[PDB]
Amino acid sequence: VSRTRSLLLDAASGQLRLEDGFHPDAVAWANLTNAIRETGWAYLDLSTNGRYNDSLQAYAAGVVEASVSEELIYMHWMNTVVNYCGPFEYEVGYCEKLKNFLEANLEWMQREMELNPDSPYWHQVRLTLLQLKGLEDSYEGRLTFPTGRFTIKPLGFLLLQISGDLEDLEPALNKTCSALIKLLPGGHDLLVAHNTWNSYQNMLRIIKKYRLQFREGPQEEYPLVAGNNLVFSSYPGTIFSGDDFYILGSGLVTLETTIGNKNPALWKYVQPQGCVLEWIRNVVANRLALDGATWADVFKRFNSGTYNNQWMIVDYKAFLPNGPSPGSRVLTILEQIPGMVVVADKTAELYKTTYWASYNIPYFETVFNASGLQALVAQYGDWFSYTKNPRAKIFQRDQSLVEDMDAMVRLMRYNDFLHDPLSLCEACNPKPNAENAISARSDLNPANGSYPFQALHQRAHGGIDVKVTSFTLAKYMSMLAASGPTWDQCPPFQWSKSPFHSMLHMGQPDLWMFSPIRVP
């Protein structure tokens, strides 16, 4: 149930070695409590020692993480990526192109680091990759700390980091989530919630708390980064959120929903050189940012045009409980497609409407238009429209009923597709559709149903969690979290009693009926 490990540097050796238990003298230590049977979550607590340089800390952080979560990593790999571009892959094809792309990209980053040893930016990127290298090395049982260049394998643990990036890399290489930010009445509080939609096979979950001692640049005279403390929802072997939902010790909450790209003329902006993958840009921005504007400035450098998201950056340092609109700084919105990033401060809009909802469609009209959504509105109607899609419509009618944390959870878990008129798809047979909800349950659509596009089909996919925080909760690096598909008004998901009983789901509860829990 619980496991603690520390990575020590033996100065006389000078070899890195793992020891069981807590050793404050170590480079890093981690502690995992698996409570998946009881709550649907595991919990990871990890620390690095600032008496060592931040490069050794990063490597050690990956090492001790892998060390306490080996079984979970094994099962997650088996559930999610074991067949991806495997030995027997038919598309031979796409896989060689993918592997060439990733090797060129990894090699491009290694070259930039060696050409720029004094760059704060490339220092942050190197820390991130050292952590990835530590994680893989540890899992394989053989530790080797690199002082210069190192090789990340394209299809090893990197594959756990790039699942979001692969959504765009697949079409670019020619292969054949709900969020709500709610200002409570009288400005009493500011609530921030996110509900990740994913495949049911991905539901091995870890909430991770990192306490690092990284510096902004490659010399010890640089200040400690603003984002050394963070809590985020995550997965085994994944050294960032993926959801995404982070509470940062710099006073920021960062979260996104995915927008993607439907314009094939934009794929030419996805290149192996001059592009840093989204997961790294996300990690680097989270570390360096003091505020929304700085987060956006850092994140949009070397835009890969992969894992194209709408990001919301909430800066709780600019929020005064009971206060009037400060005019700026509270909410920053960023949208990314290939070749284009649009950023705006949306504080005034948040104070005006009292909320900001996000649901997989870009808010910025230039981004909406550039990514090909007009043609989809024209072909299929309001489902692709920003203001008139079902989720937008449910948020419009129900957001004001969120008056507290539990009400937020209720809306974020909302799915009553059999009875809600906003869940009716006129082109579909049957008309009610379980996709048309705050928390989707695609498993509940009939397999012989008639649907106009793929998103509406029966699938082992839907809302798989909710995380909620507030001004006071974020201050204590804390959230409410519920794991599993929604069961408030829908029958609980159960693997053995579903059309998907045969899918691998190692380590996962059969029945998903968990209630929200306080983390920590």
Next chain:
Amino acid sequence: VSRTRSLLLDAASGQLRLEDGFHPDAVAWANLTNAIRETGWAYLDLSTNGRYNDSLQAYAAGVVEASVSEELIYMHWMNTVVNYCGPFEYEVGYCEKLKNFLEANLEWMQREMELNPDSPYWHQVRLTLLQLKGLEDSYEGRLTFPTGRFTIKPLGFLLLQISGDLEDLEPALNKTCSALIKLLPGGHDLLVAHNTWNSYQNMLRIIKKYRLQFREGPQEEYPLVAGNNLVFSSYPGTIFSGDDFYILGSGLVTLETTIGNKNPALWKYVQPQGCVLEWIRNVVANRLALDGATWADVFKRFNSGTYNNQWMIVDYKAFLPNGPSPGSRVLTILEQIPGMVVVADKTAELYKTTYWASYNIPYFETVFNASGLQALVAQYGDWFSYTKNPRAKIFQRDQSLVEDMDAMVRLMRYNDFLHDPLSLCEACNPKPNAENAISARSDLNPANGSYPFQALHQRAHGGIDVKVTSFTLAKYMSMLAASGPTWDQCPPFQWSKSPFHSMLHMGQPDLWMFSPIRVP
């Protein structure tokens, strides 16, 4: 449940293509009926067309086999070999040595074929490897017939063929079954039974019937091989038995139990050049043999010292029902260790004692002594002795009670370890041990038991089937077959109600309570 495919050659193309259904004009066709839910067996029926050359036939036979069993192959790979020398393997080490060994061996065979285009022997080896190449190509969805040299990947579908060979290759590269042949009273019949002991994760089973049109040598003027028709117990993706148990259309039944090698001074005889892996030697001998003597002559060429077995070759053509001992030809015994193969005709001995039992210990004293079993007898006693081990003792007391086919099944499924004095291990606590039986049930030994060596421990391993044939049944290419661990006097094995519920067993029944069936 049932699927039929044919591989056609379009002469105008001239491309190989798969079509559904039966097309007698095709190069090959196959037909799989999965009855695993009902009986514990699937059934494969495969034919090749003799109007094409035997090289194209062999390739096509692998193609159509993979074609009708893709799902089963996928599940078997996942259950058995998915983690073997994988991307994240710790023993880095052994795996590089294994891969170098197999590549050198495969390359050595390719060179011998190109240096010996007129050799019948190397023609038979090439047919076998073409079948392996067809099977892998088909599964990967891209067919390419080689007219000269070709590359087999070391860790692809080859891994499904060499699990027996790996038992000896592992220790040789420094990595850190019951049978009864029974003469019925008055010589009325001759019964031949085999009960394979294996890991429970291997219990995806296919009984395979091949009807080939191969010739002895590379020119059409050569006669058709003696063993073009065969029925054998097998596994998905495995182009030979593995058990082993074969009924050959040449009048022979071939079966083995594994002896292994415990003498490390003999590993130097396991070399990549000058050694053909046991699975190929087994297939080639089965094809070419007319009698026991010829089978042994062919099989012992290029002895790899891997998958070291005691082979029994029963020649039903030499058996006269009700007749006296013919003095020779009925039973041939062969034993293989690295650097040594001993062969003897054991007809007179069979007629004298009325039976031949086999149980993982060499009969030949020179082989018993050379493979290091004397030191194990001296350290642990009768368990390693040929005449005084538990199975030898049960056969000695009970073999005469086999008076018919059902009685044979009963003895071959025999395990009453809680009550049988012959199942008591004096060095063990508790004393009765579920390994000490005709059909082992290691799952039933207590996990906290005290045992003197590994074989006696709790393990997900034991007797997993029984096949029985007779003079009349073999003539009609037929057998009795029962799938699963024994449940005659032991509680039925059930995955969900065992200490091994977490092990992957995709596609397998949860509960194993199947009775014998007539095949076909």
